[PDB]
Amino acid sequence: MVGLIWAQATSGVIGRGGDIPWRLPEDQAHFREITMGHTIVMGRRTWDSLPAKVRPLPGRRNVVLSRQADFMASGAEVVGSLEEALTSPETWVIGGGQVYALALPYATRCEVTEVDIGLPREAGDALAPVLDETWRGETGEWRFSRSGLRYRLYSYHRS
């Protein structure tokens, strides 16, 4: 099974320069709640974005998506295929932009935080998936982060 979770600016950006152009403790607990205990899959670059000092994320089955037998994610599992990770019952695709579009076929749910930040689409930006006609959800209430940036939450299901 697959879920996709990501935090995006309005413009669609999920990463820039290997980090995230914001920080939102409202989004952080949201992300911990949904993924705690479940399987988390991330691309290799996302894994690098995790300081070795919060790696792995605690309480979850950390899976790093790479292509070779020659990469070690230390404290995690390194699988050449997406499908090698989906051995558990809930699997959460936690980025970045590749795995998303790679996992979007297997996916029924997208949990999306939309940060109200005016972030023009720069080249090389990692981007949130392209959710076609099929997906359904509705716009949330613009909620106030202590950060001072509006955010809102989205949930999608498709069948």
Ligand X SMILES: NC(=O)C1=CN([C@@H]2O[C@H](COP(=O)(O)OP(=O)(O)OC[C@H]3O[C@@H](n4cnc5c(N)ncnc54)[C@H](OP(=O)(O)O)[C@@H]3O)[C@@H](O)[C@H]2O)C=CC1
Ligand Y SMILES: CC(=O)Nc1ccc(-c2nc(N)nc(N)c2CCC2CC2)cc1
Applying CB under 6 A, which residues contact ligand Y? 5-7, 20, 23-24, 27-28, 30-31, 42, 46, 49-50, 94-95, 113
Nearest to 147 by CA among 97, 113, 96: 113
50/153 with CB nearer a copy of itself: 153
Partner whose binding site includes residue 50, from ligand Y, ligand X, a copy of itself, none (CB under 5 to 8 Å by kind): ligand Y
Considering the rule CB under 8 A, would residue 104 count as an interface residue with a copy of itself? no
Helix, strand, or coil here: 122? Answer: coil
CB-nearer residue toward a copy of itself: 48 or 90: 90
Whether residue 6 contacts residue 118, with contact meaning beta carbons closer than 8 Å, is answered with no
Q: Which of 6, 33, 8, 4 is nearest to 21 (CA)?
A: 8
CB of 69 to ligand X, least distance (A): 10
Q: Which amino acid is at 15?
A: G
Total residue length of the chain: 159
Looking at residues 50 to 89 of the shown chain, list those that interact with ligand X (rule: CB under 6 A). 65-68, 71, 80
